[PDB]
């Protein structure tokens, strides 16, 4: 299930001037656009080759929306400070996430449009794309405001229509990267840590997309409670990395097997030391 | 392609 997702961050700054507005847009785990209100002359900027060849009208219209969104978020931050009776002397953060998931019929599987204030849920469009869930009494002020303005109908029109159509266009123009999974390249390393013990570390490198599962088994049964996992992390080139480690008694290494599940793999992998 | 711009909070 492919997705397109936008991430807006608006941060007020007392005395330094206008709030800073940063936007990033992704298709699946691939970023394709960035906007930063603090840039020299702020403009939507390509981050993936399948939008770099879009013409000047595309980038002009994207830039105009980001500029207007920054101005509206500044008003929102001011209103929120009033809702919570907070100080001008403090900096505050307004975050927005929205986008569409592509369904098997090529239309919307689900749409979302969610907000957070200072790191906590503030208000969210419900999956019906018609009604809102407010997190506290302050967000109920916004909800009544957005209900009166029929904000949800405006957002629903984008999420069900324009969002899906952009996503389908991107998936076609970036077909050779966005619709081609990159299988993880795997190997196991061995490091004695104590002197009847050794760390077996199972590595997964260079895979796309980021979703992956790494599991250690001792005698066919999962060693979940003794497995250290790191969070999946970016390699910096568009691919991701992850590893899982267990401390095993020296001489028992050949019992342990690492198991790899990923979209780029026709069948799950089994590795041993 | 980004959404348009609606009401402030």
């Amino acid at each position, epitope marked *: 299930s492919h997705s397109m997702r936008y991430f807006y961050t608006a941060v007020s700054r007392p005395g330094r001037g206008e709030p800073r507005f940063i936007a990033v847009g992704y298709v699946d785990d691939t970023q394709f656009v960035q906007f930063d209100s603090d840039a020299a002359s702020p403009r939507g900027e390509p981050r993936a080759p399948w939008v770099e060849q879009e013409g000047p*009208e*595309y980038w002009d*219209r994207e830039t*105009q*929306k980001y500029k*207007r969104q920054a101005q509206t978020d500044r008003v929102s931050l001011r209103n929120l400070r009033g809702y919570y009776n907070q100080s001008e002397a403090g900096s505050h953060t307004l975050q927005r996430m929205y986008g569409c998931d592509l369904g098997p019929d090529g239309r919307l599987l689900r749409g979302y449009n969610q907000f957070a204030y200072d790191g906590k849920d503030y208000i969210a469009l419900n999956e019906d794309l018609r009604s809102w869930t407010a997190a506290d009494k302050a967000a109920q002020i916004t909800q009544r405001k957005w209900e009166a*303005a*029929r*904000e949800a109908e*405006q957002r629903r*029109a*984008y999420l069900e*229509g*324009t969002c899906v*159509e*952009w996503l389908r*266009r991107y998936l076609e123009n970036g077909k050779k990267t966005l619709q081609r999974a990159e299988h993880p390249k795997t190997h196991v390393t061995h490091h004695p840590v104590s002197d009847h013990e050794a760390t077996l570390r199972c590595w997964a490198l260079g895979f796309y997309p980021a979703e992956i599962t790494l599991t250690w088994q001792r005698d066919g049964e999962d060693q979940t409670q003794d497995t250290e996992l790191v969070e999946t992390r970016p390699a910096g080139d568009g691919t991701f990395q992850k590893w899982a480690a267990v401390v095993v008694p020296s001489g028992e290494e050949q019992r342990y097997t690492c198991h790899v599940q990923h979209e780029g793999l026709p069948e799950p992998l089994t590795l041993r030391w | *392609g*980004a*959404d*348009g*711009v*609606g*009401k402030s909070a």
Partner: T-cell receptor
Amino acid sequence: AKTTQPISVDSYEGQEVNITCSHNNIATNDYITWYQQFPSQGPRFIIQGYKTKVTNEVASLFIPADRKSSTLSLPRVSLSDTAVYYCLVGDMDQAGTALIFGKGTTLSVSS
Amino acid sequence: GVTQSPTHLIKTRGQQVTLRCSPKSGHDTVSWYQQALGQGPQFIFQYYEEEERQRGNFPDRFSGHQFPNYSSELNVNALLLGDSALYLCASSLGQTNYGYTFGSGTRLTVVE
């Protein structure tokens, strides 16, 4: 994505009338909508679409696969359909560009 | 529907005018257009939340206003004969193009 359309179309009562409109520069965040302006009136909404054929009580709207043109189809015209017909390509993005009119097509109907 | 007033108006060269429009019930955005004879409507500006949000190719002597109740004024001073036109108002909700609804216009003729 500005529109271009014929200056005029002539017709007789009871026939199907088709008005075609060219908009080669249409974008993904543009939709298609048609208005009619009778004498002594402002333009009035007829029909809108994106990529699928649309049919309502007043007209059909045909949109080919590349969306670079569109055709308004009036089923069995009468004298009361005499008006100027405007094909518009409109920004779908909220707070984007307001609707910009091109020249439009004068439809006359004879008996 | 959209209410425009007056329906017709005559002014002499150099005078000033105020045209008025109330949006359709449920609409809060107002767009003004100038339609000269034999032409399509030409976009003047659009007002939302009491502020001009975009403007077409018209000089500063064309100015606008929007009241808290969403009603709008088109103000033109130093009128010229070429300003003679049908002035159209279109209303919508929150600056969307969907549901764009026009009034019947104000026919303004500037005479020598």
